[PDB]
Design an enzyme around this catalytic site. Structure first.
Site: not given
Ligand SMILES: *[C@@](C)(CO)[C@](*)(O)[C@H](Cc1ccccc1)NC(=O)[C@H](Cc1c[nH]c2ccccc12)NC(=O)[C@@H](C)NC(=O)CN1CCOCC1
Ligand SMILES: [Mg+2]
Ligand SMILES: [Mg+2]
Lengths: 195, 244, 240, 222, 211, 235, 231, 233
Positions: H1-2
């Site tokens: 996740t970014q």
């Protein structure tokens, strides 16, 4: 599960454990035996999170039975209680700890003495003349503090135990459906069928 | 590949023997004799150091008798380095038991554990076995005083009196003759030293060529004391029994 | 890891390592198993080359696997401990997962499977052990007696012997043991087991061990004097 | 935070006849209030006289269909070109879905074909693998709009025979393929009117012993 | 859902509803919540349908393998325990399953309750699902060991009806089973709509409802 | 020494060829396939009269529609049977159907060549796998430790194999009944066996579509032996 | 001699005997023939039985809709290699939506076989394969040897007595290459080619095995009464 | 996740009678900062495919490298790498789609929306979309981000359904694309005047136009607009 009591008298250890099992808002069973015989002269009652209790108790039972067969010898109640404590102390720092509290009642045939050990899910062990887990002690310990002598007979121990259950039945909001009482002495383990 | 150079340490001979175990026992038969004698009121451990020198520092030396815990000791016969590997494992096992059950480990349980480690090296791993035979002298509250022996095969047995190392055949015959069931520690001390004095390959049995130890209930009231004899104390007991 | 294939086929279709393991069994002390109408008896030889032995603490030849099943053996003593330990662990593991004690047939099948695994696994040699496994299934009064061997094959026996001079005692059992009418009582079953060992043992003193297993977890080991009375009665009848 | 799921809308419908079966679905693909495609096929011929549609999150839907088509291929390789029966395909799909019990395929799956007695068959799945054979099933966005209509017009629920007044039910007479297609078309036309994610086009796959046939019908594009 | 099962003189009765929901939407009118593991073993389903189907069909595999290895049918006790051990592997992973393993073995008729927590209970009578409380009310007041097969089948059927009526998330139809020593016997699918009106008239119950 | 997976100059794996020699020493097992069913029969060969013969289990059930007989180092078969039973029931789990006899046999044969320096040697046992499915009907397969499997109308393995196979060559035809096949197995077993054939030292079994895989009782086989004796004495 | 104990050992003349012994297993195997035109590719295989009660061992395996092979030698090794090809063909389709080129399929087999010839413990594959297929560059025929060598050919044969069929194809080269848009005539040429390798035995209904792939023809295998036409 | 850092906005495209057109501006935004003004977001793969990418630029550069490596890998042991076994648009897309779905299934997505435009071997037009979720779809017109909301409506007026594709010429299609890019410049706050346009035709091949500008802009009417309601001056 909820209430488990223990008392060590002159020549025996008496364990009382509630019969109720609840799931959701419904009492599924009112005759559940919350105990396992670890050896002929050692009994362990238990209380805690659903499923974990029986799994842990049976796991302990298997280990002690394995030891008994391997050595052809019954471990002392003290030795069993220490083994149980270590398993719980090991458990508490695991990914998913076992949320089980136990009382270990045993008669030491070597010393000719009854012995009661109280162990919580953290691995907190104490030897006691009488013990309990959860909220059970809040109601009962005052009666035990008052009436308990170390030279009590098994019959007197049962009478004092009845008084503890009567107090629980009066002041607890919880219906635990009475208790199954078991006696541990020199002759082994037996159940009091009328209580 | 590598298969070319593999000795195959864990295989049966056509007769059903384990080559390496048998050859390890041959090694042990050249080691200094160690004797154990069990009495009603204690146990004796006596052992012979191998051809020493005058410049060897004896008082700080230990090649035969080792302490596993306060209740249990061992006499070694074979490779010392191999024995120390096992001894340290046994010391740890005794402490694991004590931590778990809060009671001192029963003698047999400790013996079985070490014997199982030896057994493993004969059945798997492709490694040479340990060239060591132990005499275990110990006490617990179940069986009281106990003597055991283990060898590289991993097989162990109990004894009233026993010898390992060199000249065990001769030594065992002498022990079988003079040993009696109602015997006491002081008598067993004398028997052990007399047996070594007759079986030794050396010219004469002296204090500097011996290691000696006792396990006695001769401790103040119901308890057990281990005594690893000092060089001067071995010299005194040799004079007392009438050997020097 | 050490992966070397030690148990392999030879040109004539034999696995020598497994066959040499049987030679180790042949060297081992004699063990015998006889089942009566309502019991099973396990007899074991003790070689009298070893005196000055402490019989209290010396590993007994018959081992309890559970309260209702026993195991005796012939061959390498150290190898037998590994099988016994594994069997004992499995016995508790069965009770834990299935809520019944093992049957004698199941326990035998497990021990035999372990022995088989050690004949086609890399880096390991076969167990130099043959076992006799006896007992009574839970809530059953029919006696059970099984045998295993290094190859991993197993089978049930009315009576069987293994170890050194087993050929002789098997010969005795084949002519003395009647299938139509097996030893009706405990006495008759023990007597026949002692008689069979007296063909091989040498002296009937401390060389014979007897272990009687009856239904409902009733297992007892006979003492020296009790066995000595059988030895006395047998020879007194023989003098005729 | 990253949300690995999405909703591509759409609606599907399977009906089992006496000796045939149909699997229909609209051809509209969407995110939020935008249209991605007016014609993006959703019902697929998977081989062995089986049709399939995985409605919901299109990425998971395409992956599941792709894996089942693969499962059919490997079933032929492994079992001597044996025909995968509809009941066997259904059980296989359960295990494909449950393999992601803890990170599910976000789809409502339906398959259709013929059973081993030649009768029409429709199987319906939830996202985690529970399945059951049925006669009639609508899945997806407008499922709740269509199913009650099918209970009424296929199984004649709450319908009784005139004159008896609730004493005698309407008998469960079988439906022809021409009659079923009418119910399908009306179901989607009605759903298109009241559901914003349904429209553009309707594609129907019909399964008989003769094979798999396709029919396409325009729907409202608003 | 509503499920029940109880032991009696002539074996064990097993009764379940057939409703399936996805929120307030009724996804299925007729879903089978019993599994025929073998001719002498049944399993009820309550909770996550996927979990119930997957794990009970996996139990059947494991129960079938038991028969092949031992040449003998698995006990009800042992089957229930295998299932509870499966649940204990996925401890706290979010499984939702409540089941009753019903059958006949050597000890006679057997009934065990098993759930996602690992809880495993032996008992005479059990009821699981959202409508279990309604079923227990009818069961507790009318249950006897001395019941006839006919009366016992009706009791289980009537108990599901009570729950289907009051519980919004229970209904559709009733599936009945009777387990004997010769195996289980299916006693049909009974639509609640039709059954309700029939019971109302014949029994005189549900007086408050108009019909 | 030498590799376990070594080729000989003739292009054969030494170990596979040597395992075949072990199978020749095993007790005889015979299978006959007919349109009414497949019959499987074995020689028990008890090493002593005190050995309870009914405990000798050389015929084994894999599934309701698949049976199996063995010959050679029979201990090696236990893991193969376990795998076969697992494969059969696992396929029933994945596909809600009975597994094809060929596919089951192929799964067992995939284990065969998984040996090297995986298990340390090939299996020392041959299997006769008999069964029925809807696609190919009644089938009999011969699974070897080479990983190869042939389908057979009739097949004999073990010590009296080549003598029995020659007898099966003459006796087998496509119109055999089940009763005829039973007597034919008993006949050929009695021929190649060392000891005299009876209900205690020989075992019969069959697989039919209706009743599935069944091991015959000693009382049932005894009557078929008595029926064999009388029909041979009839001419 | 002293250099044939394992695959990891060169001989003094630079030979690998274990690989050569694996090659020998192919020569013991039953004959199989491969040939192609510009439109179609054909496999023809002589199946072998154990005895008269036994079935005839299958020789041809399907790998994809557009690709398959015939085996000669250890059948289980063919099952392992054909399984690998099935997976690779399948990887190409699932990931790239691309039918695997026959030339690339050969390169993958070569590399898989090679690893078994250079490492200790393992063994070479004891089977030879004839791979046919139809891809974007037309019809193809490959010959695989377990040494690792893969060769693209107009026609070939492997197995016992394969030299007779190989000579026939070498004469017929100019004829059978031109057989375009006629599957039956191309099979006839293959059946006539494999016939040159027969002795004593002849082509019966349950003996012969044929496979074909082409422009508008998926890989299909013909056995039983389906090949009676060509006998 | 970014989270996406440096981003590229809309990519727009459409089919026409003989091929496909695709376009995207040359801006690399850093939130509200118009940081980088020389960023090429159309990446040709051979002479038959153009991949247009929006979203995170660092992930774009990673995909750009995967494609460059894909061409290299396809040429290995492939004599027909510049002919029959050359990379097709359908191959390039399915590869990317596989990668995108795998990355989202590991909860570590490539934060992009991609449009693969090209012409197949048989002359068929290829135009398909894929994004960070692995979601794929095809249509006569495709657009990412703001383009989906503003460009598609304009492009769909030219090609509303499949049957309008043969009726649409390259001059009409390019005119519609160029107009859409002007509209996006008016209304997308994260857009630029400078853009790139690519045409893949089955006859004339790949035409790649750089340094294009939005022109013919209407601003004059702004002079008359005064206040926010009541103000007159
Ligand atoms: C009551 C109806 C509770 O609502 C029952 O327990 C029922 C049990 C059951 C068991 C096996 C088969 C069918 C039904 N449970 C459900 O219906 C269950 C309730 C539910 C929904 N989400 C849940 C989350 C956690 C626990 C329970 C939950 N419903 C489902 O599981 C839904 C998601 N499944 C279906 O509707 C199954 N569909 C399969 C395809 O066909 C349509 C139905
Ligand atoms: Mg505490
Ligand atoms: Mg609209």
């Amino acid at each position: 599960m909820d209430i488990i009591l223990g008392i060590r008298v002159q020549d025996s250890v008496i364990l009382a454990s509630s019969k109720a099992v609840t799931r959701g808002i419904s009492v599924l069973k009112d005759s559940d035996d919350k105990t396992r015989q670890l050896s002929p002269h050692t009994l362990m009652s238990f209380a805690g999170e659903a499923g974990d209790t029986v799994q842990f108790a049976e796991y302990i039972q298997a280990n002690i039975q394995l030891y008994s067969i391997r050595e052809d010898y019954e471990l002392s109640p003290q030795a069993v209680s220490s083994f149980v404590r270590q398993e719980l102390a090991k458990s508490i720092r695991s990914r998913r700890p076992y949320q089980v509290n136990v009382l270990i009642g045993g008669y030491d045939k070597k010393k000719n003495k009854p012995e009661l050990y109280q162990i919580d899910y953290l691995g907190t062990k104490v030897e006691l003349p009488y013990g309990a887990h959860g909220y059970s002690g809040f109601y009962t310990f005052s009666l035990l503090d008052h009436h308990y002598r170390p030279d009590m007979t098994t019959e007197e121990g049962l009478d004092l135990l009845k008084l503890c259950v009567q107090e629980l039945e009066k002041r607890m909001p919880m219906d635990f459906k009475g208790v199954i009482v078991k006696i541990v002495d020199k002759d082994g383990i037996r159940q009091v069928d009328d209580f | 590949g590598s298969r070319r150079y593999d000795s195959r340490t864990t295989i049966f001979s056509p007769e059903g023997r384990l080559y390496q175990v048998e050859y390890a026992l041959e090694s042990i038969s050249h080691a200094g004799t160690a004797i154990g004698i069990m009495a009603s009121d204690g146990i004796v451990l006596a052992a012979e150091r191998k051809v020493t020198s005058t410049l060897l520092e004896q008082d700080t030396s230990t090649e035969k008798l080792y302490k596993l815990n306060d209740k249990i000791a061992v006499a070694v016969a074979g490779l010392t380095a191999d024995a120390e590997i096992l001894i340290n494992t046994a010391r740890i096992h005794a402490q694991n038991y004590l931590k778990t059950y809060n009671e001192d480990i029963p003698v047999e349980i400790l013996v079985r554990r070490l014997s199982d480690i030896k057994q493993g090296y004969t059945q798997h791993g492709g490694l040479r076995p340990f060239g060591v035979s132990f005499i275990y002298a110990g006490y617990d509250d179940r069986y009281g005083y106990q003597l055991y022996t283990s060898n590289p095969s991993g097989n162990y047995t109990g004894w009233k009196a026993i010898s390992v190392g060199a000249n065990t055949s001769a030594a065992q015959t002498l022990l079988q003759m003079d040993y009696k069931d109602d015997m006491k520690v002081d008598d067993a001390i004398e028997l052990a030293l007399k047996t070594l004095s007759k079986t030794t390959d050396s010219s004469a049995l002296t204090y500097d060529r011996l290691e000696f130890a006792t396990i006695r209930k001769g401790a103040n009231d119901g308890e057990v004391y281990q005594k690893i004899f000092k060089p001067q104390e071995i010299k005194d007991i040799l004079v007392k029994t009438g050997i020097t | 890891g050490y992966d070397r294939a030690l148990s392999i086929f030879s040109p004539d279709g034999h696995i020598f390592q497994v066959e040499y393991a049987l030679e180790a069994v042949k060297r081992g002390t004699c063990a015998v198993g006889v089942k009566g109408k309502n019991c099973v008896v396990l007899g074991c030889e003790r070689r009298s080359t070893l005196k000055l032995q402490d019989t209290r603490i010396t590993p007994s030849k018959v081992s309890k696997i559970d309260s209702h099943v026993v195991l005796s053996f012939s061959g390498l003593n150290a190898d037998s401990r590994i099988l016994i330990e594994k069997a004992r662990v499995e016995a508790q593991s069965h009770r834990l997962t299935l809520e019944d004690p093992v049957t004698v047939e199941y326990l035998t099948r497990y021990v035999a499977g372990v022995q088989q695994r050690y004949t086609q696994s890399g880096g390991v040699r076969p167990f130099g052990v043959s076992t006799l496994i006896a007992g009574f299934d839970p809530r059953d009064d029919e006696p059970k007696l099984y045998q295993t061997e290094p190859s991993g094959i197993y089978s049930s026996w009315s009576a069987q012997t293994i170890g050194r001079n087993s050929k002789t005692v098997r010969e005795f059992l084949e002519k003395n043991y009647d299938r139509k009418e097996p030893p009706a009582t405990v006495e008759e079953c023990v007597k026949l087991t002692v008689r069979s060992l007296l063909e091989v043992v040498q002296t009937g003193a401390k060389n014979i061990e007897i272990t009687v297993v009856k239904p409902d977890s009733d297992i007892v080991a006979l003492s020296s004097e009790e066995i000595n009375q059988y030895v006395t009665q047998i020879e007194q009848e023989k003098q005729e | 935070q990253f949300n690995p799921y999405g909703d591509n809308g759409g609606t599907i419908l399977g009906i089992a006849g006496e000796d045939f079966a149909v699997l229909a679905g609209d051809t509209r693909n969407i995110t939020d209030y935008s249209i991605n495609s007016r014609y993006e096929p959703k019902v697929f011929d998977c081989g062995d006289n089986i049709v399939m549609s995985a409605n919901g999150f299109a990425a998971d839907g395409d992956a599941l269909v792709k894996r089942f088509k693969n499962s059919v291929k490997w079933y032929h390789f492994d079992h001597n070109d044996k025909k995968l029966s509809i009941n066997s395909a259904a059980r296989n799909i359960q295990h494909l879905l449950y393999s992601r019990r803890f990170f599910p395929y976000y789809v409502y799956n339906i398959i259709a074909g013929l059973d081993e007695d030649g009768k029409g068959a429709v199987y319906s799945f939830d996202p985690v693998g529970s399945y059951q054979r049925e006669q009639c099933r609508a899945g997806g966005a407008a499922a709740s709009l269509i199913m009650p209509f099918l209970d009424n017009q296929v199984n004649f629920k709450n319908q009784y025979e005139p004159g008896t007044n609730g004493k005698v039910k309407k008998p469960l007479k079988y439906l022809s393929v021409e009659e079923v297609i009418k119910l399908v078309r009306d179901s989607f036309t009605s759903a298109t009117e009241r559901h914003i994610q349904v429209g553009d086009g309707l594609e129907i796959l019909i399964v008989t012993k003769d094979g798999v046939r396709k029919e396409f019908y325009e729907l409202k594009r608003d | 859902t509503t499920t029940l099962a109880f032991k009696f003189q002539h074996g064990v009765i097993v009764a379940v509803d057939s409703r399936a929901t996805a929120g307030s939407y009724i996804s299925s009118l007729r879903m089978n919540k019993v599994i025929e593991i073998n001719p002498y073993l049944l399993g009820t389903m309550s909770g996550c349908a996927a979990d119930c189907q997957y794990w009970e069909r996996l139990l059947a595999k494991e129960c079938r393998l038991y028969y092949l290895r031992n040449g003998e049918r698995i006990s009800v006790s042992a089957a229930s325990k295998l299932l509870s051990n499966m649940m204990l592997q996925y401890r706290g992973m979010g499984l939702s399953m409540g089941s009753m393993i019903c059958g006949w073995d050597k000890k006679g008729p057997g009934l065990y309750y098993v759930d996602d927590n690992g809880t495993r209970l032996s008992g005479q009578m059990f009821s699981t699902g959202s409508g279990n409380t309604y079923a227990y009310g009818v069961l507790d007041s009318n249950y006897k060991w001395d019941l006839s097969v006919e009366d016992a089948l009706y009791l289980g059927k009537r108990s599901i009806l009570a729950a289907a009526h009051r519980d919004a998330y229970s209904g559709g139809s009733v599936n009945l089973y009777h387990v004997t020593e010769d195996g289980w016997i299916y006693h049909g699918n009974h639509d609640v709509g039709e059954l309700f009106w029939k019971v109302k008239e014949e029994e005189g119950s549900f007086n408050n409802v108009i019909g | 020494d030498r590799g376990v997976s070594t080729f000989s100059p003739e292009g054969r794996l030494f170990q596979v060829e040597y395992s075949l020699e072990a199978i020749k020493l095993g007790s005889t097992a015979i299978g006959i396939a007919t349109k009414e069913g497949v019959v499987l029969g074995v020689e028990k060969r008890a090493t002593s009269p005190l050995l309870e013969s009914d405990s000798i289990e050389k015929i084994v059930e894999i599934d309701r529609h698949i049976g199996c007989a063995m010959s050679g180092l029979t201990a090696d078969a236990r893991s193969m049977i376990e795998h076969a039973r697992t494969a059969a029931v696992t396929h029933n789990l994945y596909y809600d159907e009975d597994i094809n006899v060929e596919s089951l046999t192929q799964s067992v044969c995939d284990l065969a060549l998984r040996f090297g320096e995986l298990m340390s040697r090939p299996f020392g046992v041959a299997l006769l796998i008999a069964g029925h499915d809807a696609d190919d009907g009644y089938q009999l397969f011969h699974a070897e430790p080479s990983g190869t499997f042939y389908r057979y109308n009739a097949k004999a393995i073990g010590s009296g194999s080549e003598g029995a196979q020659a007898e099966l060559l003459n006796e087998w035809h496509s119109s055999l009944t089940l009763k005829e096949a039973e007597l034919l197995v008993l006949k050929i077993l009695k021929q190649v066996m060392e000891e005299k054939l009876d209900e205690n030292n020989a075992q019969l079994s069959c697989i039919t579509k209706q009743d599935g895989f069944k091991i015959y009782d000693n009382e049932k086989t005894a009557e078929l032996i008595k029926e064999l004796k009388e029909k041979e004495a009839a001419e | 001699n002293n250099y044939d104990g394992d695959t990891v050992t060169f001989s003094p003349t630079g030979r690998l005997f274990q690989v050569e012994y694996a090659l020998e297993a192919i020569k013991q195997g039953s004959v199989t023939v491969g040939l192609r035109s510009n439109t179609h590719a054909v496999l023809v295989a002589l199946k072998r039985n154990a005895d008269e009660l036994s079935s005839y061992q299958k020789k041809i395996i399907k790998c994809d809709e557009h690709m398959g092979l015939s085996l000669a030698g250890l059948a289980p090794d063919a099952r392992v290699l054909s399984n690998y090809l099935r997976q690779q063909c399948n990887y190409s389709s699932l990931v790239f939506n691309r039918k695997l080129a026959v030339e690339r399929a050969g390169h993958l087999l070569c590399d898989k076989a090679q690893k078994n010839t250079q490492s200790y413990g393992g063994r070479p594959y004891g089977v030879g394969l004839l791979i046919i297929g139809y891809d974007k560059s037309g019809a193809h025929l490959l010959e695989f040897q377990p040494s690792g060598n893969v060769t693209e050919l107009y026609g070939t044969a492997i197995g016992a007595r394969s030299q007779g069929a190989k000579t026939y194809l070498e004469r017929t080269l100019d004829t059978f290459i031109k057989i375009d848009g006629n599957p039956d005539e191309l099979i006839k040429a293959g059946v006539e080619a494999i016939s040159q390798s027969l002795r004593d035995e002849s082509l019966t209904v349950d003996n012969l095995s044929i496979a074909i792939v082409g422009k508008d023809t998926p890989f299909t295998i013909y056995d039983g009464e389906a090949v009676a036409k060509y006998i | 996740t970014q989270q996406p850092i440096v981003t590229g906005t809309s990519v727009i495209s459409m089919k026409y009678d003989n091929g496909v057109i695709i376009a995207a501006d040359n801006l690399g935004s850093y939130g509200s900062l118009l940081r980088f003004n020389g960023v090429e977001r159309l990446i040709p793969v051979g002479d038959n495919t153009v991949v247009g990418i929006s979203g995170d630029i660092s992930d774009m550069q990673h995909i750009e490298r995967l494609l460059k490596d894909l061409v290299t890998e396809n040429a290995y042991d492939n004599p027909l790498a510049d002919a029959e076994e050359a990379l097709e648009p359908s191959y390039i897309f399915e590869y990317l789609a596989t990668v995108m779905y795998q990355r989202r299934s590991k909860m570590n997505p490539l934060w992009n929306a991609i449009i693969v435009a090209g012409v197949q071997s048989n002359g068929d037009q290829f135009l398909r979309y894929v994004n960070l979720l692995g979601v794929t779809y095809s249509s006569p017109t495709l657009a990412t981000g703001f383009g989906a909301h503003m460009a598609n409506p304009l492009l769909r007026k030219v090609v509303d359904r499949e049957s309008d594709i043969p009726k649409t010429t390259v001059q009409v299609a390019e005119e519609a694309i160029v107009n859409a890019m002007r509209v996006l410049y008016y209304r997308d706050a994260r857009s630029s005047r400078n853009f790139s346009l690519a045409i893949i035709d089955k006859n004339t091949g790949l035409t790649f136009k750089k340094n294009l500008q939005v022109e013919n802009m209407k601003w004059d009417f702004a002079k008359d607009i005064k206040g926010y309601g009541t103000q007159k001056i």
